[PDB]
Amino acid sequence: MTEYKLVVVGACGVGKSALTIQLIQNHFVDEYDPTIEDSYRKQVVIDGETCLLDILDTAGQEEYSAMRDQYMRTGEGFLCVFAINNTKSFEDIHHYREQIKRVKDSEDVPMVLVGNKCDLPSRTVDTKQAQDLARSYGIPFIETSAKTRQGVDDAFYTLVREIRKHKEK
Numbered sequence: 001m002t003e004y005k006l007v008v009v010g011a012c013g014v015g016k017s018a019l020t021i022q023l024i025q026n027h028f029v030d031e032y033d034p035t036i037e038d039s040y041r042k043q044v045v046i047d048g049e050t051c052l053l054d055i056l057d058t059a060g061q062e063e064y065s066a067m068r069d070q071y072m073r074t075g076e077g078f079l080c081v082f083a084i085n086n087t088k089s090f091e092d093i094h095h096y097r098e099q100i101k102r103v104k105d106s107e108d109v110p111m112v113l114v115g116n117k118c119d120l121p122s123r124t125v126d127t128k129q130a131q132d133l134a135r136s137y138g139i140p141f142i143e144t145s146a147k148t149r150q151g152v153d154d155a156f157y158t159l160v161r162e163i164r165k166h167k168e169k
């Protein structure tokens with residue numbers, strides 16, 4: 001069956017693990033060690049296609065930089081997560097965008113921009129500013145809450161659709 005290798009990246013504390021575990025296990029985790037990096041796999045149906053998602057929940061630095069380069073080269077699509085109450089996490093998106101393109105040595109890399117924690121009242125990044133950044137990259141932007149599940153399926157399924165568009169060229 002078709003497999004899609006997805007990689008979730010973003011600053012520590014933005015909800016990468018919470019988003020991934022909501023997609024896979026359908027519950028919100030209040031506490032998950034920020035240093036744990038692991039992969040999950042789930043069979044889903046997306047637009048009538050039965051497919052396997054293989055998702056890497058990243059945790060930042062690796063023992064050796066060759067490990068980072070390896071998962072970036074093998075990953076097919078990237079979910080670039082910031083938190084709407086953490087401006088620094090939004091500014092760090094520039095770094096992840098650049099680093100992924102550099103390792104892949106490609107200008108066209110399937111990517112979706114995710115603004116997580118949309119259930120919280122505190123917001124430092126308004127939607128407009130994130131839409132402006134996504135428009136500059138030519139990629140979709142989705143606001144999510146790993147707590148309420150709002151937008152979670154859409155974020156991951158939209159990324160799969162971006163991969164499919166990249167592949168048909």
Ligand SMILES: Nc1nc2c(ncn2[C@@H]2O[C@H](COP(=O)(O)OP(=O)(O)O)[C@@H](O)[C@H]2O)c(=O)[nH]1
Nearest residue numbers: 012013014015016017018029030117145146147
């Ligand atoms: N309220 C709220 N809290 C969240 C959300 N996503 C993650 N969190 C919390 O934010 C903290 C960090 O999330 P985590 O998934 O560990 O972030 P990671 O470092 O990117 O993996 C945890 O305390 C989670 O409970 C969300 O959508 N809403």
Ligand SMILES: [Mg+2]
Nearest residue numbers: 016017033034
């Ligand atoms: Mg984590």
